[PDB]
């Protein structure tokens, strides 16, 4: 698709068999989703946003569908205001910015 | 141009007679610039994201040149860790997300 930006670029994702809404975010290095259960071990990570830094749980090699495109990669879990698809997975689905 | 997302999508902007670097951020509703002087009246605003909220000054009808494309709109000024071009100006330069 070609997504314009007059509205937030929200898409449906699928993770762990469940559908969720997430924001396609070119300003995010990483993918961050709200509290949920994921398999396997996690590693610690600190991330910075507009208001300061938070701790999150880093899960690697997670299967995630993004607007119907398959990705497998790192997902961070923590107290984000909205589910964010960042550049680590935007590159896997072939996304570019165009103007 | 077509900008891939292997790296942060940073571009040069001109605002207030000043050249700055800024992040093209589809996850941001608003454009937020580090502390600088701008003309006209302003009013205070709180904006949030990962890590919580910051207080900014809202200036309206500000002209920005973004990677050679001119746009006008509201610009928020405050202690953002990075200069952000958000959707309110991305739309004006015809930026889309494509995959």
């Amino acid at each position: 698709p070609q997504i314009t930006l007059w509205k937030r670029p929200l898409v449906t994702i699928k993770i762990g068999g469940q559908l969720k809404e997430a924001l396609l975010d070119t300003g995010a290095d990483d993918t961050v989703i709200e509290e949920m259960s994921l398999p396997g071990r996690w590693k610690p990570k600190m991330i910075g946003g507009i208001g300061g830094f938070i701790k999150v749980r880093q899960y690697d090699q997670i299967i995630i569908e993004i607007a119907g495109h398959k990705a497998i990669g790192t997902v961070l879990v923590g107290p984000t205001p909205v589910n964010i698809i960042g550049r680590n997975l935007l590159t896997q689905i072939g996304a570019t910015l165009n103007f | 141009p077509q900008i891939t997302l292997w790296k942060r999508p940073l571009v040069t902007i001109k605002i207030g007679g000043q050249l700055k670097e800024a992040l093209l951020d589809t996850g941001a509703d608003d454009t937020v610039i580090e502390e600088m002087s701008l003309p006209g009246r302003w009013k205070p605003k709180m904006i949030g994201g990962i890590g919580g909220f910051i207080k900014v000054r809202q200036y309206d009808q500000i002209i920005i040149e973004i990677a050679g494309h001119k746009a006008i709109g509201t610009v928020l000024v405050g202690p953002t860790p990075v200069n952000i071009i958000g959707r309110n100006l991305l739309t004006q330069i015809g930026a889309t997300l494509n995959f």
């Binding site: 924001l23 995010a28 290095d29 946003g49 984000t80 964010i84 | 990962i50 860790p81 952000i84």
Partner: peptide, 7 residues
């Protein structure tokens, strides 16, 4: 540290 800006 890694940077995540939504807003």
């Amino acid at each position: 540290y890694d940077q995540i800006x939504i807003e």
